[PDB]
Amino acid sequence: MEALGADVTQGLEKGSLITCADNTGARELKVISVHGYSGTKNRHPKAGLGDKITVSVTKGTPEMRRQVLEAVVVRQRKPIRRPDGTRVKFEDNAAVIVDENEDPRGTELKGPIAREVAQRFGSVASAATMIV
């Protein structure tokens, strides 16, 4: 994938529960897999700000629940490092559901988004209200 432009300390793992920062009808998402990741023995596959992950819907409308979908991590609590050394972290961990072509499935995004995510999923960033 295109370089992020920041170093990331994965703050999530397979099994983590996170917020669904959009209006698709999904309130809570469970991380199942990390697109393009291969770990090592005994290591829980990790995910962080910027990754594309497969997720299952834990909380939300009946129609969305239990569905296995792709998403993009947009916010995380564990800090990330920017070129100038400054660290950046968020209030929560969030991901926006996205389709086969990486376009957000929902119409609106809720909450801020790391500018770095724009360097990959521009269509996601160009639906963001606030880009930090």
Partner 1 sequence: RECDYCGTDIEPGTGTMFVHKDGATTHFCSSKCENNADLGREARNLEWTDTAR
Partner 2 sequence: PQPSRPRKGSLGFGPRKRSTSETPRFNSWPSDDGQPGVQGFAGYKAGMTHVVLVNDEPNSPREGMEETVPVTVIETPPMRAVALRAYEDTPYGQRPLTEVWTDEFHSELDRTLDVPEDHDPDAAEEQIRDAHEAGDLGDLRLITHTVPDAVPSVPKKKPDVMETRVGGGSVSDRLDHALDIVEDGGEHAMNDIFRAGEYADVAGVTKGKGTQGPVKRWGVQKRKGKHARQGWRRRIGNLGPWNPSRVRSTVPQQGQTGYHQRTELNKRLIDIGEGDEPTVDGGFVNYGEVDGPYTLVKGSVPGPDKRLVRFRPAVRPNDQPRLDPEVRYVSNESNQG
Partner RNA sequence: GGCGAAAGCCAAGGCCUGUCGGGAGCAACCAACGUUAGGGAAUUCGGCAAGUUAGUCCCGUACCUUCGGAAGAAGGGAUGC
Partner RNA sequence: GGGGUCUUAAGGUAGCGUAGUACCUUGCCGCAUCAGUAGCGGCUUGCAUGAAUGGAUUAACCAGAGCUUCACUGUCCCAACGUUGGGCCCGGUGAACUGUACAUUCCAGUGCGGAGUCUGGAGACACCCAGGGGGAAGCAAAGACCCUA
Partner RNA sequence: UAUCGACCGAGUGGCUUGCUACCUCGAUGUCGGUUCCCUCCAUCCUGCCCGUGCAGAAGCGGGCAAGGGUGAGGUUGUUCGCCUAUUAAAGGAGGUCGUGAGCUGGGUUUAGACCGUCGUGAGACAGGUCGGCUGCUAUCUACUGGGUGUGUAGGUGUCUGACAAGAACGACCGUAUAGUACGAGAGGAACUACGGUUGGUGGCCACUGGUGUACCGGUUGUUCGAGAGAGCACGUGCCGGGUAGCCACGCCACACGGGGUAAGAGCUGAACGCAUCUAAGCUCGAAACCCACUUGGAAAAGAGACACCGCCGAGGUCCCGCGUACAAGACGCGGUCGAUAGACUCGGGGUGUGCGCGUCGAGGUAACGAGACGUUAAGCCCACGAGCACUAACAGACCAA
Comparison of 97 and 113: residue with beta carbon closer to partner 1: 113
Q: Choose the binding region for partner 1 from 9-17, 26-34, 35-43, 124-132 (rule: CB under 8 A).
A: 124-132
CB of 95 to partner 2, least distance (A): 25
Which burial class, exposed, middle or buried, applies to 18 when counting CB atoms under 10 A from its CB (0-12, 13-18, 19+)?
A: buried
Contact with partner 1 (CB under 8 A) among 35, 44, 66, 87: 87
Q: Name which of partner 2, RNA, partner 1, none residue 88 binds, using a CB cut-off of 5 to 8 Å depending on partner kind.
A: partner 1
> Is the Cα torsion angle 5, 46, 74, 91 positive or negative in sign?
negative
65 phi, psi to nearest 5 deg: -50, 145
Q: 């296995």: which residue's tokens?
A: 68
CB of 5 to partner 1, least distance (A): 15
Q: Which of residues 95-114 bind partner 1 (CB under 8 A)?
A: 111-112
In whole angstroms, what is the distance from residue 127 CA to residue 86 CA?
26
Contact with RNA (CB under 7 A) among 23, 25, 27, 37: 37
CB of 40 to partner 1, least distance (A): 30
In whole angstroms, what is the distance from residue 96 CA to residue 74 CA?
7
